[PDB]
Design a protein around this ligand. Sequence first.
Ligand SMILES: *[C@@H]1O[C@H](CO)[C@@H](O[C@@H]2O[C@H](CO)[C@@H](O[C@@H]3O[C@H](CO)[C@@H](O)[C@H](O)[C@@H]3O)[C@H](O)[C@H]2NC(C)=O)[C@H](O)[C@H]1NC(C)=O
Ligand SMILES: *[C@@H]1O[C@H](CO)[C@@H](O[C@@H]2O[C@H](CO)[C@@H](O[C@@H]3O[C@H](CO)[C@@H](O)[C@H](O)[C@@H]3O)[C@H](O)[C@H]2NC(C)=O)[C@H](O)[C@H]1NC(C)=O
Ligand SMILES: *[C@@H]1O[C@H](CO)[C@@H](O[C@@H]2O[C@H](CO)[C@@H](O[C@@H]3O[C@H](CO)[C@@H](O)[C@H](O)[C@@H]3O)[C@H](O)[C@H]2NC(C)=O)[C@H](O)[C@H]1NC(C)=O
Ligand SMILES: *[C@@H]1O[C@H](CO)[C@@H](O[C@@H]2O[C@H](CO)[C@@H](O[C@@H]3O[C@H](CO)[C@@H](O)[C@H](O)[C@@H]3O)[C@H](O)[C@H]2NC(C)=O)[C@H](O)[C@H]1NC(C)=O
Ligand SMILES: *[C@@H]1O[C@H](CO)[C@@H](O[C@@H]2O[C@H](CO)[C@@H](O[C@@H]3O[C@H](CO)[C@@H](O)[C@H](O)[C@@H]3O)[C@H](O)[C@H]2NC(C)=O)[C@H](O)[C@H]1NC(C)=O
Ligand SMILES: *[C@@H]1O[C@H](CO)[C@@H](O[C@@H]2O[C@H](CO)[C@@H](O[C@@H]3O[C@H](CO)[C@@H](O)[C@H](O)[C@@H]3O)[C@H](O)[C@H]2NC(C)=O)[C@H](O)[C@H]1NC(C)=O
Ligand SMILES: [Pt+2]
Ligand SMILES: [Pt+2]
Ligand SMILES: [Pt+2]
Ligand SMILES: [Pt+2]
Ligand SMILES: [Pt+2]
Ligand SMILES: [Pt+2]
Ligand SMILES: [Pt+2]
Ligand SMILES: [Pt+2]
Ligand SMILES: [Pt+2]
Ligand SMILES: [Pt+2]
Ligand SMILES: [Pt+2]
Ligand SMILES: [Pt+2]
Lengths: 186, 188, 188, 186, 188, 186
Amino acid sequence: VTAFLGERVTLTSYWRRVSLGPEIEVSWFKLGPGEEQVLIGRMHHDVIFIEWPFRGFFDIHRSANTFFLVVTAANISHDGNYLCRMKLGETEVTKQEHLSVVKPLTLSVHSERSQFPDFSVLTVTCTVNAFPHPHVQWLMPVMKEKDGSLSVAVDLSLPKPWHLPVTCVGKNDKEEAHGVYVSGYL
Amino acid sequence: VTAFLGERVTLTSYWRRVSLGPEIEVSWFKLGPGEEQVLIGRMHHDVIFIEWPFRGFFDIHRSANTFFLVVTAANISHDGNYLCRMKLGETEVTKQEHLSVVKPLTLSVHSERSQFPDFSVLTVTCTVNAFPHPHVQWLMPGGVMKEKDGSLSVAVDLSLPKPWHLPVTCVGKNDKEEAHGVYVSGYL
Amino acid sequence: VTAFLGERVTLTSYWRRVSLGPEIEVSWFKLGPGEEQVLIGRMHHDVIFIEWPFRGFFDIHRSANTFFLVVTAANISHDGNYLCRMKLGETEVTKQEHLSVVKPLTLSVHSERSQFPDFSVLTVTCTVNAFPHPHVQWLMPGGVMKEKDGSLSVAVDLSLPKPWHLPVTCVGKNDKEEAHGVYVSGYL
Amino acid sequence: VTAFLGERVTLTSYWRRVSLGPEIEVSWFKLGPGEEQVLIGRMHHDVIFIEWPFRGFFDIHRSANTFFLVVTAANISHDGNYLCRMKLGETEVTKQEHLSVVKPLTLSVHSERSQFPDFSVLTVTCTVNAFPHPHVQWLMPVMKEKDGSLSVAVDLSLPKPWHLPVTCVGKNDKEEAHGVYVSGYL
Amino acid sequence: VTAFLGERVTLTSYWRRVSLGPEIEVSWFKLGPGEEQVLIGRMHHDVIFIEWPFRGFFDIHRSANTFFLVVTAANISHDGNYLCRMKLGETEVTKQEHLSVVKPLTLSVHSERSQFPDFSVLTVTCTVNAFPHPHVQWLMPGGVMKEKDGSLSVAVDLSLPKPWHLPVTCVGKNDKEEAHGVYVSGYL
Amino acid sequence: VTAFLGERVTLTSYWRRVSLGPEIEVSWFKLGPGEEQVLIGRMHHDVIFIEWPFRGFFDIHRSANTFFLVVTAANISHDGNYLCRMKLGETEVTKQEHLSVVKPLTLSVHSERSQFPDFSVLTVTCTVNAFPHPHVQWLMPVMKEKDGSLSVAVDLSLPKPWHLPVTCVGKNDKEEAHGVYVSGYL
Ligand SMILES: *[C@@H]1O[C@H](CO)[C@@H](O[C@@H]2O[C@H](CO)[C@@H](O[C@@H]3O[C@H](CO)[C@@H](O)[C@H](O)[C@@H]3O)[C@H](O)[C@H]2NC(C)=O)[C@H](O)[C@H]1NC(C)=O
Ligand SMILES: *[C@@H]1O[C@H](CO)[C@@H](O[C@@H]2O[C@H](CO)[C@@H](O[C@@H]3O[C@H](CO)[C@@H](O)[C@H](O)[C@@H]3O)[C@H](O)[C@H]2NC(C)=O)[C@H](O)[C@H]1NC(C)=O
Ligand SMILES: *[C@@H]1O[C@H](CO)[C@@H](O[C@@H]2O[C@H](CO)[C@@H](O[C@@H]3O[C@H](CO)[C@@H](O)[C@H](O)[C@@H]3O)[C@H](O)[C@H]2NC(C)=O)[C@H](O)[C@H]1NC(C)=O
Ligand SMILES: *[C@@H]1O[C@H](CO)[C@@H](O[C@@H]2O[C@H](CO)[C@@H](O[C@@H]3O[C@H](CO)[C@@H](O)[C@H](O)[C@@H]3O)[C@H](O)[C@H]2NC(C)=O)[C@H](O)[C@H]1NC(C)=O
Ligand SMILES: *[C@@H]1O[C@H](CO)[C@@H](O[C@@H]2O[C@H](CO)[C@@H](O[C@@H]3O[C@H](CO)[C@@H](O)[C@H](O)[C@@H]3O)[C@H](O)[C@H]2NC(C)=O)[C@H](O)[C@H]1NC(C)=O
Ligand SMILES: *[C@@H]1O[C@H](CO)[C@@H](O[C@@H]2O[C@H](CO)[C@@H](O[C@@H]3O[C@H](CO)[C@@H](O)[C@H](O)[C@@H]3O)[C@H](O)[C@H]2NC(C)=O)[C@H](O)[C@H]1NC(C)=O
Ligand SMILES: [Pt+2]
Ligand SMILES: [Pt+2]
Ligand SMILES: [Pt+2]
Ligand SMILES: [Pt+2]
Ligand SMILES: [Pt+2]
Ligand SMILES: [Pt+2]
Ligand SMILES: [Pt+2]
Ligand SMILES: [Pt+2]
Ligand SMILES: [Pt+2]
Ligand SMILES: [Pt+2]
Ligand SMILES: [Pt+2]
Ligand SMILES: [Pt+2]
């Protein structure tokens, strides 16, 4: 499933076949490296307990034979693989679900003339912030953010006479924006 | 003169025809609201004193008969008029110089999709920060915020229901300065 | 329903006789002072939006024809009445549910002896913290403080001159909830 | 001597026999491990100097041939052994005095029902904070505090049907309180 | 009695002719603005209680028939009058004692040269901090500042154009206390 | 050149002979140990760029064939040697200039009687704060400050009867002040 940052989102699991609902002992885990398990919460007979680190971040519920992991507001740490362990008696079945969290890209353009040796060089900067894959490219004719998003910036230095307009292509997988520097202040 | 934000800048002045160099008493004033003349500093006989509030932000020096007010890193408060008063004995001449401080525009584009009743509405946001005159406008195929640095920000939202009227282009300006941002395709 | 402080809690609602599941527009409201209905969130066609002030604190989901408001960790502000509004076309039905939040009582006993004119007077202090209704009372053989968490504290002092009228028993209550604390012997 | 937390308290020493009052050079030390000496203050000819770390915490004075260490407000760091060194000429006599600081016990009772797998288990918690020796015990039919006191807590888990009332016995040497959980909210 | 800032100090009192030691109820009061008597502490039968606001700052003890109020580290707020009230049965006697707290003066000298129009003017600054009575005066060959500690500071500037009228001597006082600071030669 | 703390100050350099003004590429460096170079700024064709650590602290300019380093407000870190590198083509000439920063001295006198064994000893303290060379000396008949200045203090202990007046001599190279303790409070 794909969620955008801040959106409610849901993963689901079910046992089989097996149609036994509230009798199944359900636990959901967030998977780390290399598939290391961190318990989010447990459900049995429609009594649910969320572990304190995930409280308000995740909930669990049942509808018939389907088990739900709900993410109240997706953030970038929530990206990746989850494990639903379903247990009846001394028997057990696990299912893996994937959540893709996507921060829509922000494309910024800004320019700055040189200050030494003279003021004749226009450096145009193009910045893409996004998740998972920001990408930046100039046409002529990197950093980790507090929220876990990634920023990339590229400078184009332009000797006089300035090759204006220049177009910046920002991408986040299939998402794309352009930034066009058209003319200088002077 | 025009200076971009952060740049070393220079205003200049000289007297005439009067080649007297260090004999001339020079004082530089920042002109305020107002009519008010606020002293930056003085130079005479190659002794330069810069008033405490301006220290580090402005300097004064002479090259022969030319007098210089140096702004060490142009900030938006430095935008406005300046006065160089030159004195010899009982006679004075005054020269008025303008400094334009410009922050080059930053244009940003980003989109967000709707979360209720469904996920079908794209809102695309275009933000221009600049000084003195940011302006933004959406093309198809809200206050001024004052930032900490004195520059001004302006933002416009455009909502697109399905089918998204894509290629949308944002036009940003700051006087003659111009940039665009084009939202081409969503992530899906 | 009754929830202790910190517990996951659930209010439920369904329409009738009307087995329409995802076709029904559900909204949940917290009832305020007041007469005021404050929107927690909405569900329709299995798209759930929780208002920003309630995000993380409440969730909404459906199981077939039953609608659930989940409180993720019951706090004392959550105590009160809730409204589930169910809509189909132009017709609505509304269900009012109550949540009672209870903090289980804490009873504390401690004694302190007098320091002047001498060391012979024992004062024994009994403190009950709970929600909604802490109450304390001393048996032989002062404001309500509002805590940060919304719970209420109540304290009673009993002074005993020599010979100390020991076994003293403190009785603490919170509605039907009951605890005692008995001061048996001093340190000497 | 026994002082309770916050009470003024006094230790005393004297030389012998020897009846020579203000002529004796008196110094008091707080004893650490293993009897390590830390100077509190000195007295001679009724001139007294308290070392800055103990200033406002301790004073010293004389009455005739008796030397006094006064503790202005006993705290738990003041618990333990003190040394009075009494010096006349190149001769010297030391006496050891003991201060017991006692924090009267606080007994707390609180209960909490289980949240998973169901809500049927009552865990009753009984906490004793005290100094020197808090102790807790349940009848059916650990941590160090900022002020230097010690807290101990014990949980009794009760399956349904709840074995109510349960009585908690708190002790601090001979000090004793009981905590009785009598009935649940529901 | 006189105590310098930071010193252990003692006021004393006794009754008469009345050799009753521990039988006497003693209380010590700090006298305020005002006419107001503020209780420091009490002693009776060798039980001493010091009021919470004075704890650590003052103590009381007895040696036979003499009663002592000990100030553990004299501060400037301790300067003023004190009352020892001695009681036996229904009869009382009261003794008034004065504590003078003195901060010994600090005298500082420093010079600064002028920066405009030239470097030829020396200003020499002399600062006296003390309690109760700092005073400063320049000899040839402006408020009181209240410091955090209750002491008082006083500063005088003397400008000297070339040729500098050197040996200049600063005279500092605090009642009978006296110090000088002499500026002898500049750095050049 | 000598500057006092807080004063504007100037260093100058020139190439030769060579009379070619704005054609020369000028860079000024602050010298550390052992002559390590830290760039302050560069000038060429009367375009000047000051490096951000020195911005508002230093400026550079030309008057004809003379190159100026200006220090806007001298502080103690600015004390020591500077290097002017002057470059034309692949040829280069460097000149060393020295700035002496001087904090005028502050002489303080204060006295304090003993507190143990009795109150009969007058300790008079004399403190000189200065830069570069504070010095203190008592006549009978060390520390580094936040601003980089140096403080030195000397105590004179005086048994009764007090040898008053005592005179303190403060020096900072040729700068000199005296402090005279003339009489006690009591
Ligand atoms: C993204 O979501 C994750 C949860 O899935 C967020 O992490 C959680 O953040 C909370 C709030 O900080 C953590 O609780 C803090 O814990 C420490 C004790 O270790 C304590 O000092 C605080 O009072 C508070 O309880 C919680 O442990 C943590 N959960 C996990 C599983 O890491 C993350 O902060 C979210 N936001 C962003 C922007 O990433
Ligand atoms: C833009 O440049 C102006 C200066 O031309 C900057 O203003 C000056 O700012 C400094 C603080 O860095 C002020 O110095 C402070 O003044 C207070 C107020 O009396 C004093 O308490 C402090 O110790 C300190 O000296 C200075 O007076 C002020 N000068 C003016 C306004 O003429 C301004 O900070 C810069 N703005 C930005 C956004 O960088
Ligand atoms: C008990 O639960 C209620 C929620 O049902 C908690 O109140 C909510 O508390 C949060 C803060 O954690 C508020 O979010 C903040 O609001 C301010 C004000 O506009 C905003 O500046 C912050 O950025 C942040 O979003 C939220 O609005 C508020 N919701 C309400 C009152 O409906 C409350 O904090 C909990 N109380 C305790 C004692 O835990
Ligand atoms: C219990 O009583 C002892 C004294 O018998 C208390 O310790 C003393 O606490 C004072 C106040 O903190 C200490 O003075 C601090 O010293 C540091 C320098 O090391 C400085 O940063 C502060 O301005 C202040 O002077 C004092 O040194 C310390 N004395 C000893 C002998 O340790 C203890 O704090 C008392 N209270 C409790 C609750 O334990
Ligand atoms: C000089 O000595 C006097 C005492 O004789 C000092 O005043 C006392 O100062 C303490 C604080 O260290 C006060 O204790 C505090 O009072 C507040 C106010 O109610 C309370 O919130 C705090 O928890 C704390 O107990 C005390 O009441 C006060 N006594 C008085 C004024 O009689 C004073 O601090 C000393 N001054 C200097 C400059 O050292
Ligand atoms: C004496 O003058 C020197 C400069 O010649 C002063 O040093 C400079 O001080 C500024 C202001 O702190 C430094 O900029 C700080 O840099 C850090 C990053 O490393 C950043 O956290 C701050 O926002 C700020 O930019 C500057 O780097 C430093 N320059 C040098 C060459 O060291 C010194 O502070 C002056 N004053 C005194 C009393 O010494
Ligand atoms: Pt996916
Ligand atoms: Pt970044
Ligand atoms: Pt010239
Ligand atoms: Pt803004
Ligand atoms: Pt369904
Ligand atoms: Pt309270
Ligand atoms: Pt003992
Ligand atoms: Pt604890
Ligand atoms: Pt006695
Ligand atoms: Pt002051
Ligand atoms: Pt020099
Ligand atoms: Pt120092």
